[model samples]
Target: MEPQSDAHVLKSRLEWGEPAFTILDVRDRSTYNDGHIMGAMAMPIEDLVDRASSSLEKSRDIYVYGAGDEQTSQAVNLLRSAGFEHVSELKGGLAAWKAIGGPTEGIIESRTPAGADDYNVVSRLEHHHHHH
Candidate 1:
């Protein structure tokens, strides 16, 4: 049977911060750069095998996702074919991950702090302007 992983379980593992693992995003470059699970490394499907093989150990635990389930499955298969032993597909991709409140970051999103409310941020901006 093909290996599968639940987003909730992954989130829990992440919270515990044990069993070091990598979250692999096998989506398009633009999509990955726009927003992805925190700490997920972008490896576009086209370059997935090459990058993964060179950078990751064959025995590393990898949690992979893509544009959708089909794409994700393809990535998992490619990794397994290339001798990766512990690749699991993160079902439901980014949307499901967001539903579970998993943290995400992107080029622009990374600049913002986690759990920052708009009112407090606006007040800070106003304070900065007044001080200047």
Candidate 2:
């Protein structure tokens, strides 16, 4: 239930006003300013572990995403070793987030913008891929 999370999990929490968790973007500031999860803190991996330790509580639920999965996992490792009790690496960066209609923002007063195509993204709600 931790370490990694799907898009819906994070999206659902925000829908409920569950502000107990914090979302972090582990990358450069410009990239963050370009496009990122709405309200996510820009914690560049270089200064991530150090700043997070002082600013965030050890048990705080954290959802983190980066430019790539490699960097995301690295950030999680650093946070855990620094004593963070709850850290979940976001499964899909920005791409999958938009696919699920998750909110995002940037320097241009960015807000939710949905094309009709975007509305039907989660078409795979039911699947028979289950196997023994």
Candidate 3:
């Protein structure tokens, strides 16, 4: 299935003004530490199976996001493996969130700098590595 858009999720959150699901940021620690949407918790893909799985219940909605879809998918898989059947990933990652003007925190680390170049570099690596 396709991922959900941050814009749509943000709008829904704003309209409802209620806690929906856990907004889990699945990027690396450095990247997640740099900046993330408010109300989001860091759940780096590498540690997601251990860290996040414990914080969330199987029945709650768990929304995941990363610099892009690959890490997000990793988080999704981890959640599913932990028996979270309602997990979801954000489409287009943080790029689409920025495109829609979603607010994010300032990051401390510089793992993935902004710009197409950073994204392209990661994309190329994933393409060649066959991560899926």
Candidate 4:
């Protein structure tokens, strides 16, 4: 229980969807919004201790990642120091997850209105002109 786990192991757990766990993204908010593991919650390193303590239970199975393995380890250690018993550092971070075909989503991807027709620039321009 030295606070280490591989991306593949975490991926397997996610696939199973049992024994509830949380994927914690400790990168900056901007980077997190750009792309992160699907369902991973943002708790940037600076605010990690406070945010996690307030919103997460100590017993939660937390799988954490940041910009790289070192950053991920730092976040994991912080969580463990804060008395979280089951925190795990996700190896290779997001790149590793993506390599294994783990699902991912971000702000632009999530907020885009679904529909091929929604992407028409002419419609958007006309709508803008109408509003003006």
Candidate 4 C-alpha lDDT tens digits along 1-132: 237777777887788746388889898889899889889998998889888999998889888998899999999889888988889899899888888888889876467667665554554333334553
Instruction: TM-score for candidate 4, please give it.
Output: 0.77
Query: What is the lDDT, from 0 to 100, of the residue 74 in candidate 4?
Result: 95
Cα lDDT of candidate 1 equals 0.84
Better lDDT candidate (2, 3)? 2
| Candidate 2 ranges with C-alpha deviation above 4 Å | 108-132
C-alpha root-mean-square deviation, candidate 4? 9.6
Question: TM-score-based ranking, best first?
Answer: 1, 4, 2, 3
The window of 10 residues in a row where model 2 has the poorest summed lDDT is: 115-124
What tens digits encode model 3's per-residue C-alpha lDDT throughout 53-94? 667787777778888888777778878888887787887787
- Tens-place lDDT per residue, model 2, 1-132, is 389988778888888657689888896778888888887998988888988987998899999888777888889888999999899888876677878998888864465555654454554565578688
TM-score of 2: 0.76
Per-residue lDDT of model 1, residues 1-132, tens digit only: 137987777887888757488989998888888888888998987889998999998888999988788898899999988999989998888778888998888875565556755654433333334553
TM-score on alpha carbons, each prediction: 0.77, 0.76, 0.70, 0.77
| Model 3 TM-score, 2 decimals | 0.70
Provide the RMSD of all predictions against the true structure, rounded to 1 decimal: 11.0, 17.5, 16.2, 9.6
Per-model lDDT: 0.84, 0.83, 0.72, 0.85
Evaluate model 3: give its lDDT.
0.72
